[PDB]
Design an enzyme around this catalytic site. Structure first.
Site, PDB file in Angstrom:
ATOM      1  N   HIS A  51       1.048  -0.850  -0.349  1.00 28.61           N
ATOM      2  CA  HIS A  51       0.431   0.064  -0.005  1.00 28.61           C
ATOM      3  C   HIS A  51       0.514   1.422  -0.159  1.00 28.61           C
ATOM      4  O   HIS A  51       1.480   1.198   0.763  1.00 28.61           O
ATOM      5  CB  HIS A  51      -0.843   0.306   0.825  1.00 28.61           C
ATOM      6  CG  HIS A  51      -2.752  -0.423   1.055  1.00 28.61           C
ATOM      7  ND1 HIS A  51      -2.553  -1.685   2.256  1.00 28.61           N
ATOM      8  CD2 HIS A  51      -2.554  -0.948   0.397  1.00 28.61           C
ATOM      9  CE1 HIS A  51      -3.990  -2.496   1.703  1.00 28.61           C
ATOM     10  NE2 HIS A  51      -3.660  -2.561   0.206  1.00 28.61           N
ATOM     11  N   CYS A 113       0.324   1.638  -4.937  1.00 27.38           N
ATOM     12  CA  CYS A 113      -0.778   3.129  -5.514  1.00 27.38           C
ATOM     13  C   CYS A 113      -0.319   4.639  -6.254  1.00 27.38           C
ATOM     14  O   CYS A 113       0.955   4.607  -5.416  1.00 27.38           O
ATOM     15  CB  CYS A 113      -1.876   3.086  -4.552  1.00 27.38           C
ATOM     16  SG  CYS A 113      -2.798   1.957  -4.273  1.00 27.38           S
TER      17      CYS A 113
END
Length: 144
Positions: A51, A113
């Site tokens: 993440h 991301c």
């Protein structure tokens, strides 16, 4: 209680995280998760996703600041594998080809991301080529 299978260090961006097996949400929130079931350190294309940021704070976001030439080290506490970053891209989430083994090359591919915004479709990709494999001793393990 996620039972890490290794640790990753990128000294250039002060990143040190556990490596965990699979892309469970817990694994992606705690460190670098193995993106393929059958990958081995220092073999084919070793793919790791994390993440961008957690509730806690920054996690794999530092990848945005990684430069071509920077070193990436991983260890399983048997051997230490050091890679040299050869590219950084922002790519669409559809571009799955980036984690595929590349014939005659030993690669590491780091994925996160492109931002912490809800429904981000782009990914930061850092890829490097294996520069050295060592015994995991005092000298080689200091950076973890």
């Amino acid at each position: 209680n996620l039972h890490p299978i290794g640790k990753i260090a990128i000294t250039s961006v002060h990143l040190k995280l556990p490596i965990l097996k699979g892309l469970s949400n817990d694994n992606l929130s705690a460190g670098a998760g193995t993106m393929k079931a059958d990958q081995k350190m220092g073999e084919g294309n070793y793919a790791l996703a994390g993440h961008y940021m957690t509730n806690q704070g920054i996690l794999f976001s530092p990848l945005k600041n990684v430069q071509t030439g920077d070193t990436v080290a991983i260890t399983n506490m048997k051997k230490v594998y050091t890679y040299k970053v050869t590219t950084k891209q922002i790519v669409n989430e559809t571009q799955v080809q980036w984690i595929d083994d590349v014939a005659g090359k030993k690669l590491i591919t780091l994925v996160t991301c492109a931002s912490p915004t809800e429904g981000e479709v782009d990914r930061i990709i850092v890829q490097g080529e294996l520069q050295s494999v060592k015994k995991a001793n005092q000298k080689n393990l200091k950076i973890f």
